[PDB]
């Protein structure tokens, strides 16, 4: 009956968290999952979230179904963050937006929409990409391919090879792009590079699906959203999935959004209706709590401002560890370049360590990373940094 | 939803004495959605201290899963002691149905699903959303006001091995009309005989008789050693529609087959939404696995159960005081918050335009919309349309 069902190998990222918790080392360090940890080494509750949550709890409200699209303020908050407050596209009523179960739920709903309305469309993800990108899209019965992205030889982007790749594709083929803070390489495109990319997307009439999960961790909110906002300004059929998991430090509550930028108000209504309908088929409506937190924080002027402040402090703390690590690494190893540490953006960096070197760090030192050498920089702090440096140089000499 | 056109017609009605019985939500005596005291206590515990918010395991919280398992199958049911049930926390019962269907589609691609005539609207949409061919088995008989039982079994016999039946264990939506224990016993015997897959969808456990009775069809199917899928929802019994709390349980012949299935359930969650929501999971975890809170919760559910039966009684007694030839026992014979009132689509219309009392044109009424300040208004309005 069930003997035919295959064993599930386990999620590489989420299985690793349990190996970390199950490990009983004094100096254990988790650079595996894309979570931000404070200077103390613990996952913070943002102050703005704390105020918001005290509001929700005072008093305790009845809990009806949210609209399928989630809360108006949650939707507005997604939109204003991605496109800009008072953006003409928003004022023209041209973006259809739903609350989703994290960035993951946004990717699902989006891909399902794409599958249904563009059944011949093939999706293409970065080489490499965040693993779950492939799983979500194939889950909708869409054929998934890679586009050359990361120059595994140089630690930069195979830009020409990538561009030449996008010229070969079919109309309405879907590119799954990282607007900023690449997962897992940390290697982003320059503005100028985005311009050329987005020019090709137009000429070839491909569908951009931008997946953004670390807005505010790269440069700043508006700057990180460049690729999104440019695409809008060019008039492209845009899909955006956004996540508040990371910048609201609210991973567990499953907060995200999906926005579809449309040619007309009436097409917006149609797509929005379709989005609502896709949601109905998957989970009916999104969770209330996470929704309210997003709503309350995004649309309270003082909380929004405080939140922006808190995201940048996170961004700054990550950036300072990049340079603190680079400097203590620099001194210990002569024969190697460490420029990638301060050149990459976001929570992640490709260290360029072999799967073996990654696993020696795990076994001997209790330092956790993905086998592809991805390191979550956020797990570093002034306590563990001399320890991780010392460990890295000990695995690099060997 | 088709309900949303009705909700739109209802808001469009200016009648100040209007009543919405087309709702699919429990209201208390004051005609509002209640916050349960056990939920209120739970959420006060979650609020102090505000705790960091890691991802949940893709399966949800251990306690959420254990909660679902003990509620469905019985505290220390052998099937649990034997570890023969794969259980994940889900985005309500909706998300439980989704994971279930996609699972079935991936591994039993040839399987067709059959839902009751009639059923909860989304049953069809969810399974059709997975590229499963969905049909209807006969259930409700308009002529008797009960179950086309013989015809239903007859339909079940014509179905292939591994075909899926969507079965309401109790408190049938939208009719209120339930199978007896005897009727269940033969159903599960047909299902076993034909090696069909029982998919049971339980959203109103505790609104029918009690927790254990409501779960009869579930627990028997386990005793018989059937390949049972269960989707359960706390939306209603926990009054937590918006936090999206349910479970999906799959009962397997072997400990090893459970690990395989539990594995794919996880892999399915991974492709849809990565992991379920922290808050709702915690409320379920606290309320199910705190002994006193569990008792209080059970009590509060039975208070709702009893309020529904209190309104079913009052309505019938007003009706029977005026009409003699009909047997209204079916109003009290039905269970949960839904009632096929057996009014003609024309009679439903009459109630709308004359009284602003809103039912679904298939005679469906949500009994929980009745409270002491509209019961007499609504009962009397009904006598008029039946007298016309
Ligand atoms: C972490 C991540 C996600 C997942 O976001 P959730 O809010 O957890 O669903 C999606 N895309 C990328 C690129 C990510 O890094
Ligand atoms: C309400 C209901 C569901 C779905 O419950 P949710 O928790 O809101 O997803 C499923 N089946 C039936 C019969 C229902 O009444
Ligand atoms: O990128 C990271 O570091 C994580 O956010 C990924 C991640 C977190 N939870 C998951 C569940 C399934 C698949 C991937 C994930
Ligand atoms: Mg599908
Ligand atoms: Mg507000």
Numbering used by the authors:
A (entry chain A): 1 to 398
B (entry chain B): 11 to 398
Please quote the authors directly.
The mechanism of active site adjustment toward substrates of psychrophilic aromatic amino acid aminotransferase (PsyArAT) from Psychrobacter sp. B6 is discussed based on crystal structures of complexes with four hydroxy-analogs of substrates: phenylalanine, tyrosine, tryptophan and aspartic acid. These competitive inhibitors are bound in the active center of PsyArAT but do not undergo transamination reaction, which makes them an outstanding tool for examination of the enzyme catalytic center.
In PsyArAT/WOH, PLP was added to the crystallization solution, which helped to obtain very good electron density maps for the cofactor. High similarity of interactions with an inhibitor in catalytic centers of monomers A and C allowed for the description of only one of them, and we arbitrary choose monomer A. The carboxylic group of the WOH is planar to the Arg374 guanidine group, and two hydrogen bonds of 3.2 Å and 2.9 Å are made between them. The another contact in the length of 2.4 Å, of the mentioned carboxyl group, was made with the peptide bond hydrogen of Gly34, being part of the motile, long entrance loop. Internal aldimine present in the catalytic center interacts with the carboxyl group of the WOH; the bond between the Schiff base nitrogen and oxygen atom is 3.2 Å long. Like in the case of the remaining complexes with aromatic ligands, FOH and YOH, Arg280*, from the second monomer, is in the “down” position, and one of its terminal nitrogen atoms creates two hydrogen bonds with side chains of Tyr8 and Asp11 (3.2 Å and 2.6 Å). Interestingly, in the active site of monomer A and C in the PsyArAT/WOH complex, the presence of a big, hydrophobic indole group of the WOH molecule, just near the Arg280* residue, prevented its contact with the Asn132 side chain (which was pushed away from the active pocket).
